[PDB]
Design a protein around this ligand. Sequence first.
Ligand code: R5H
Ligand code: R5H
Ligand code: CL
Lengths: 304, 299
Amino acid sequence: SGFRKMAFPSGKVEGCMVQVTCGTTTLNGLWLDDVVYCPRHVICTSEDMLNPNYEDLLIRKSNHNFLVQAGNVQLRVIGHSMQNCVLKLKVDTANPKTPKYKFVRIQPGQTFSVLACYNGSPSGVYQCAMRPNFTIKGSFLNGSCGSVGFNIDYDCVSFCYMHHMELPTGVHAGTDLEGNFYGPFVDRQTAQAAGTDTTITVNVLAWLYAAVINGDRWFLNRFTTTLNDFNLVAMKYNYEPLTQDHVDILGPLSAQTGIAVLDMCASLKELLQNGMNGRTILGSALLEDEFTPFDVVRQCSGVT
Amino acid sequence: SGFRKMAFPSGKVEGCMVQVTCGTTTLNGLWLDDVVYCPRHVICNPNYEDLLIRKSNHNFLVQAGNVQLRVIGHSMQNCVLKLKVDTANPKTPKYKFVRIQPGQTFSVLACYNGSPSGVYQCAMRPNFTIKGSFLNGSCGSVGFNIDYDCVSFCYMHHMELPTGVHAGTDLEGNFYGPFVDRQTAQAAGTDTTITVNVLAWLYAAVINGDRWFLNRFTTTLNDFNLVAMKYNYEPLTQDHVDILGPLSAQTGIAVLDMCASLKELLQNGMNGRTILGSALLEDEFTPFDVVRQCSGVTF
Ligand SMILES: COC1CN(S(=O)(=O)N2Cc3ccc(Cl)cc3[C@H](C(=O)Nc3cncc4ccccc34)C2)C1
Ligand SMILES: COC1CN(S(=O)(=O)N2Cc3ccc(Cl)cc3[C@H](C(=O)Nc3cncc4ccccc34)C2)C1
Ligand SMILES: [Cl-]
């Protein structure tokens, strides 16, 4: 019993964290085999951030301008290349702690664990989601750039995020491990702001099924809804549209509890209308949207 | 910016998790040097000395990854079983066994069949239970804090109570709370809110840019304690005030000035507003957790 925001064990990722220094800038890198991956803005000064020309800054650097430190050992850089917004630093030592891994690009609504690092040293691990506006609500300070997001399935680490910047509202933006940003963001000091954020509807439904599995049904009602009527109501509360794919994905949770997806949509409509009236659901007074249907199935019991 | 329920990096602890099997019971063990520590209920009104004396070393199957460890000795210390093994753990980190006090937080590495599945942060409640997330097979999962390179093990999971909350021991086998390790009528006592932690979280909200709850008022410690007792909040002591000193200095808000804000939040509610994305007053961040997360301390 119980339901917590659970992160994956971070050990496999801790063994890949290194410190990367170029001139006066120091941030984190990910060392997998003989390549260190890090944000390309490690080659910039603060002045450069307004309108940086990365190709022009990069061509002026040599391998020995990049200092890479793994624990107390200096790694030697023997090559460098840029792929989108990430710099790939070829080193002459392969990481003996390289786990089984994949680079995966995630979609909004997906969750992942973040190993927050400073100076190539991990300081904490937390769970979060790719918001519909492509930002993440992380906890990062200066020097955290290059920290990574991941999931672990079986013995395989799937790296999905690399941290690059903090937006004016305090939320965070970054890239996949191929250097492509999530969202319309640029690694440039420009007037860019997070779009209006919305609630991840399929995740709120998954968390309502998690509450039913754990023994709570006070929020259910005798009504149902069509998918179209549910979306017309949901959009009024800044909730993301629920698609037939989302309905399909909730199938197993609907079967385990005996509550149809459109019947759970009717409870959600009524919770949006009424609020919780002094009650909590799984120890929360707000509707939680950072647990996917997959996260609920992995954490919750198979019985009830 | 941002404020999350953050756990310590679990790697140093992952390298110690093993699976322990005795008869039909399988749970988790902690392998440090040549000893595996696990709940003594793995051998199960139980008479544990009588139950233990009937077992031999080969009755305990200990598995570290895909390798079987050979048990060469066994002894009981309170509610913890210590299994001497033939191989010392080459991944044993620098460690201490520490007993924590209610209100203190720690990270839990939840494991099943000696394999870690997740990490989360939690606090020892004033009623000595933890609000964890555990299923059958999670017994032997451990709680810890990390300071520099040293892992301080403070908790070992033993059982789930009827309300869905959890009970366990320190690594010397002494239970936290008035709990015993057997099937009997056991219930968590009435819980209270950890006041010093709510104040620390209110300082964290101010550091992150939220000040709507601040007011011009102050309070005495006695008047604040008379109000707090009415709302099932733990008494705030002069030690708690002292411990909040650094957060008070960083924000410029006196501890009794923050107590005046908390009194108004308890007497009036939030009025449709939130603090750090929460509509409830959060009590599972200590003053030290707030300082560490708002300063970037690494391990
Ligand atoms: C909160 O201040 C804003 C303004 N800056 S900054 O430090 O001047 N800045 C500008 C900038 C522009 C583009 C890119 Cl790709 C990166 C960067 C850097 C950046 O974003 N670094 C940070 C990342 N995460 C978290 C942070 C937390 C605090 C402070 C820097 C944090 C530096 C972040
Ligand atoms: C929730 O059911 C109650 C009744 N049982 S039980 O499974 O029969 N039970 C009895 C018992 C008595 C003493 C001790 Cl020290 C341990 C144990 C075990 C226990 O507590 N193990 C569990 C721990 N955490 C989480 C769980 C989740 C589900 C189910 C067992 C979970 C098993 C717990
Ligand atoms: Cl995805």
